[PDB]
Nucleic acid binder design. Structure first.
Lengths: 107, 49, 178, 62
RNA sequence: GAAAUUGUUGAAAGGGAAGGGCAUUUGAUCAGACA
RNA sequence: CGUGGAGGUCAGUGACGAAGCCUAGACCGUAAGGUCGGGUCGAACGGCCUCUAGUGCAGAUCUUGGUGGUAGUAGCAAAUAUUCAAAUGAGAACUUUGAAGACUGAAGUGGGGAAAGGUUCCACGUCAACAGCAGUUGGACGUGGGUUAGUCGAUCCUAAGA
RNA sequence: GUGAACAGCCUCUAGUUGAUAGAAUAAUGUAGAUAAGGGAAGUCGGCAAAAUAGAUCCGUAACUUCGGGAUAAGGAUUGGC
């Protein structure tokens, strides 16, 4: 079931008490685990525009709230995982506050 | 050529068990070194920290 | 070619081998006893979950100072462990022994692993360096893997002497009891 | 493919260090063919390898 | 292709050692003699 | 009693399996040891009267060679630090390009050289070993290619000295 | 660039991103720190850490081989515009 939604994600409560050399690499593994919870897939991808959005304030200055877009798609032939995989990508907005989850229509 | 290519790999095998990192590693292992065991260590200056 | 002691029919049996495999030996002994005696199609389903941290290989013999884990409760052992490089060779031979039984034309579901054996191979001598200029060995422990799968077969007048008195006793009770 | 040879070789042609030359990831079959200095000149002027102009060190605060 | 040492199978034993001596039980196994 | 050879005898044994090796199978001798059956094996070897010695092993912090217990244990913790996607591939924390992020910060992790090494430089093919994890990459492996001087040096002069 | 400076700290040009990695945050460690009240009672001994620290001006004792002692001691001051 191809379904694409929006999400904020509170990276302040997930990076609590982590060493400063491992905050930005941990925030990558937190999003791969966040996509597994909502979509229920194992193959999670991150567009390189999302990688720039985490690492922009150095290793130790990861933002509190990101605003993600997660697309669940069909997988290609002769892949032995499962036919579905997520694709996490960013949507830029002025403030990440005050926004709740919204189902994106397709066309 | 494939018969003599096999005779290389039948006779390389004895050197890989000794982990020769070439066919040119003939660094010989000494049984016993003198500076380890030939001494009587007492009060005073000694031969190692 | 000169297997271990086998108690089976060599007509309805397939086999496979692996020699000089640069593995650990103690890690491959304990992953062979976990799979011994099982059914073949359940054995391949088992080793996949070892790689995914669902079920564990229990360490029975070579198991000192191993940390405890929770997944050995299925076996009644507190010490278990999930060796990855041991399984990637052992299921490489189960995938071999299946296709050997395909070529003879043996049954798919009745096939089970009966004999599986792992013993020592010649070690790779490599050297390292310690304090005070001392040279100590740093060597491996490769192994020989060999296994035989088998179709399950659904199947599972001592002369006696007695004296002339003991002969007369049974003859007496036969006379009385009608 | 393996492109360290051409990465080094285009630094010597353009005249800038290895940190500055750019080899595009979509034309990876074109650049793997070029194995001489002569062909690396051809990959520059059609726009496959570029220069990456200098990182700024401004002096407005000074 | 011996021994140290080891793997699988088969038998057997086991509350802070193991191994040994005399004597028998149980279990496995076996030679001899009766024309 | 047993061992390596020697002279003599058994017109001894043997490819229809000599010697050896294994053998909680048998028999004799108080014992040293001797004989037989079974399995493995593949070419020489015993009995008896005599002669000869480099003739009998549990130790010598014994000699050489080989393997254990400890043990899948101690450990792989200095030098601020890694991350995503694609390509290649049977396989990618480590290879390659790109996007970010950081460091050495001109008494440098930069660019040339003297002693010293000797083909490591460069390309192609390729992963059994080696890089204390890995590996498709390498200062590894296989095959080839490459160092051009009337002016730069040596050669020439003398120093302390030979 | 700051500064007395080729100090220390940050950057441009060139270069590397190599040193086995993941998950947790017990004790005991190693390395780095902070602490009310008291201030060497600790201890063979203030061992360690703390305190003072650059500059401008004022001010400097015994003693002396007349050169020194001396940055003696001690005290005021420092940004931005």
């Amino acid at each position: 079931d191809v379904v694409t939604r929006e999400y904020t994600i509170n990276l302040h409560k997930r990076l609590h008490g982590v060493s400063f050399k491992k905050r930005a690499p941990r925030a990558v593994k937190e999003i791969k685990k966040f996509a597994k919870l909502h979509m229920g897939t194992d193959d999670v991808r991150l567009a390189p525009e999302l990688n720039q959005a985490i690492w922009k304030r150095g290793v130790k200055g990861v933002e509190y709230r990101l605003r993600l877009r997660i697309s669940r798609k069909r997988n290609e032939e002769e892949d032995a995982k499962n036919p579905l995989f997520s694709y996490v990508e960013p949507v830029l907005v002025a403030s990440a506050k005050g926004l709740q989850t919204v189902v994106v229509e397709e066309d | 050529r494939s018969k003599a290519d096999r005779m290389a790999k039948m006779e390389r095998r004895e050197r890989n068990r000794h982990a020769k990192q070439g066919e040119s590693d003939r660094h010989n292992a000494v049984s016993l070194s003198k500076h380890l065991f030939s001494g009587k260590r007492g009060v005073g200056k000694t031969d190692f920290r | 070619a000169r297997y271990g002691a086998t108690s089976t029919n060599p007509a309805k049996s397939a086999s496979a081998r692996g020699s000089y495999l640069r593995v650990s030996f103690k890690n491959t002994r304990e992953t062979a006893q976990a799979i011994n005696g099982w059914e073949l199609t359940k054995a391949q389903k088992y080793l996949e979950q070892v790689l995914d941290h669902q079920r564990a290989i229990p360490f029975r013999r070579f198991n000192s100072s191993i940390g405890r884990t929770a997944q050995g409760k299925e076996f009644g052992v507190t010490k278990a462990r999930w060796p990855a490089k041991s399984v990637k060779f052992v299921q490489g031979l189960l995938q071999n022994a299946a296709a050997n039984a395909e070529a003879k034309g043996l049954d798919a579901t009745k096939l089970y692993v009966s004999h599986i054996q792992v013993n020592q191979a010649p070690k790779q001598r490599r050297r390292t360096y310690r304090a005070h200029g001392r040279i100590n060995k740093y060597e491996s422990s490769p192994s020989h893997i060999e296994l035989v799968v088998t179709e399950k077969e659904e199947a599972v007048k001592k002369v006696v002497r007695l004296t002339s008195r003991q002969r007369g006793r049974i003859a007496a009770q036969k006379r009385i009891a009608a | 493919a393996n492109l360290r040879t051409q990465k080094r070789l285009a630094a010597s042609v353009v005249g800038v260090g290895k940190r500055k030359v750019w080899l595009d990831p979509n034309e990876t079959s074109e650049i793997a063919q070029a194995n001489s200095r002569n062909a690396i000149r051809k990959l520059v002027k059609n726009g496959t390898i570029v220069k990456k102009a200098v990182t700024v060190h401004s002096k407005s605060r000074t």
